[PDB]
Structure 1
Amino acid sequence: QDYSGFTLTPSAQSPRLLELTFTEQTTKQFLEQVAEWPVQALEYKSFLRFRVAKILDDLCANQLQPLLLKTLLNRAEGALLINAVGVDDVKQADEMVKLATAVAHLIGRSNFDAMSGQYYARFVVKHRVMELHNDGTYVEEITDYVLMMKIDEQNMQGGNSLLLHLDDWEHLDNYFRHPLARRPMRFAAKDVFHPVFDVDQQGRPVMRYIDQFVQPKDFEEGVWLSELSDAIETSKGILSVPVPVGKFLLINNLFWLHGRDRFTPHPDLRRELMRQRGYFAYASNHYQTHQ
């Protein structure tokens, strides 16, 4: 469908993953109206992350924020691949960070990243599969969204993002109905405890899993987790998604798992990524007390 300032279309991998593209006109207006604040301004003054979010959404006739929220909160969807026409080269890395910042802070707030010391982190790669997982499993607070952007890509064969929506996982009911699915387990990167599975508000399964940080306490937990790992990694429901330079995935971390495919080692390989993770925060008609 045609919205104000962007277009929206289902991906070739899955109707659950929608591709959102900001038009050139919208992109150049946004970059002009946020040229005043460099990325370092966003790092130091967090309210500016919300200011550039507003500018972007205002440029979309206030259609962007409700569309982002409806898509990410919809159990049937929950995943976007987002880009802006004309932003597609590593030389525009700062513009990429500004744009991703604006989109994220229309739907929530991005958390501190211990690896960068900022609300986002940039990584350079210069090659086996990264297994599917949820982020944020080793802290008490829930991470609702994962944002992963391709900043640069050179002589890169393979390395697609891997995605699995829990409602596409043919082994969901077998593992979810197991008693250990509800057992709180230790997670360590202070340790926290929570089960591998939980439920959303409607009783449907969500996951809080990563194989590196879950710490099975005994043989019973361990053997079950290793079968869970196999059952996830071999699932026929996994999506394999190219993420070209200037595109980013924005996914609901509760019922999507993500990872990364193997890629070819090449001497001149360069891949740059940018990540953000945070929680949802948005207005809705709902109950409160007092005045």
Structure 2
Amino acid sequence: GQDYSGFTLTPSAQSPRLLELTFTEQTTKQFLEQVAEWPVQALEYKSFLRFRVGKILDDLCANQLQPLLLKTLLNRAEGALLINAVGIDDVAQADEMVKLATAVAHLIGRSNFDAMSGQYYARFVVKNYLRQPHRVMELHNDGTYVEEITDYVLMMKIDEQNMQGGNSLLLHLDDWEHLDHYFRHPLARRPMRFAAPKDVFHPVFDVDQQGRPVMRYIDQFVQPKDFEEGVWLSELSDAIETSKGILSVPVPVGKFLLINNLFWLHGRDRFTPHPDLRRELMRQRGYFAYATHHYQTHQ
């Protein structure tokens, strides 16, 4: 995998669709110097600073970062990245981790308000029905019960102690062996009710600009209105969960997954409970916003 200014990029061991982007130690060192004056708390109060820290990182990569992130995330054949910075790999560096993740996100779009934290990101600690270790968290898309589309999901590993399992699960729609069967079903186009934990109605599948399937699915929030929709959804669920195309991805401390939420589903594998278990995560979810040469009216 290739050499860019300030970082390297290589395919993952799980899939060529998922690429691993690592910022050099020198880029990392300089980034942290140049953003030291804004603590995370400044980023939380002034959203424009989220874009500024973005600019600082991209400028350190000779402006090669932003176009690469976008080309990868929007490329149907790929659409997923695992990102890290050499030197940021310990829980003591959580703030620095948030700054990094924030900078990358705000080069490609904007992170949405998170109702769990009341901020643009959320950090969660896991320590020893839905909260359950031996439970796989089923593959899904985020953002299914609001009108606005969530284009990206960012999941960062902040701490990991005494943890067995709990890999991120991923499925690219084009690796799913049953796509054609479910996409070509009439109920693939049936608007269904999705309800928060005001209701919205949208189909479970849609298409991208070129007519290729995309999904907006989660088992917990979809609300089949009758026996027809119900049985079909229970079959679709089994067809996703038993897929041979599912990826299992370890996310080491300091690294984060950044994926296109339209044609990747994500989930979490089970893990072993242990009295001294500690896992800390950070999430952001947002929309893409980027410049292209395209048409406009007026002056």
| Identity between Structure 1 and Structure 2 (%) | 98
Give, in angstroms, the shift of residue 128 of structure 1.
1.2
Give, in angstroms, the shift of residue 279 of structure 1.
0.3
Give, in angstroms, the shift of residue 121 of structure 1.
0.3
CA distance in structure 1 between the aligned counterparts of 2:89 and 2:135, rounded to whole angstroms: 26
Give, in angstroms, the shift of residue 155 of structure 1.
0.3
Aligned to 1:242: 250
Q: Deviations over 1:84-113 (max 9, x none)?
A: 001000000000000000000000000000
CA distance in structure 1 between the aligned counterparts of 2:186 and 2:72, rounded to whole angstroms: 32
**3-state DSSP of counterpart to 1:139:** coil
**Structure 2 stretches of 5 or more lacking a match?**
128-133
CA distance in structure 2 between the aligned counterparts of 1:206 and 1:262, rounded to whole angstroms: 26
Q: Deviations over 1:35-77 (max 9, x none)?
A: 0000000000000000000000000000000000000000000
Give, in angstroms, the shift of residue 222 of structure 1.
0.4
**3-state DSSP of counterpart to 1:230:** helix
Q: Deviations over 1:100-149 (max 9, x none)?
A: 00000000000000000000000111141000000000000000000000
**3-state DSSP of counterpart to 1:67:** helix
Q: Deviations over 1:209-235 (max 9, x none)?
A: 000000000100000000000000000
Q: Deviations over 1:8-35 (max 9, x none)?
A: 0000000000000000000010000000
Aligned to 1:95: 96
Aligned to 2:130: none
Aligned to 1:144: 151
Aligned to 2:237: 229
CA RMSD of aligned residues (A): 0.4
Q: How does 1:75-224 map to 2 (within 5 A)?
A: 75-126=76-127, 127-189=134-196, 190-224=198-232
Give, in angstroms, the shift of residue 167 of structure 1.
0.0
**3-state DSSP of counterpart to 1:149:** strand
| Divergent runs of 4+, >2 A | none
Q: Deviations over 1:173-229 (max 9, x none)?
A: 000000000000000111000000000000000000000000000100000000000
CA distance in structure 2 between the aligned counterparts of 1:51 and 1:138, rounded to whole angstroms: 31
CA distance in structure 2 between the aligned counterparts of 1:128 and 1:159, rounded to whole angstroms: 10
Normalised by the size of structure 1, how large is the TM-score? 1.00
Q: Deviations over 1:217-257 (max 9, x none)?
A: 01000000000000000000000000000000000000000
**Structure 1 stretches of 5 or more lacking a match?**
none
CA distance in structure 1 between the aligned counterparts of 2:95 and 2:191, rounded to whole angstroms: 41
CA distance in structure 2 between the aligned counterparts of 1:14 and 1:43, rounded to whole angstroms: 35
**3-state DSSP of counterpart to 2:93:** helix
**3-state DSSP of counterpart to 1:52:** helix
CA distance in structure 2 between the aligned counterparts of 1:267 and 1:232, rounded to whole angstroms: 33
**3-state DSSP of counterpart to 2:42:** helix
**3-state DSSP of counterpart to 1:91:** helix
Equivalent residue pairs, number: 291
**3-state DSSP of counterpart to 2:211:** coil
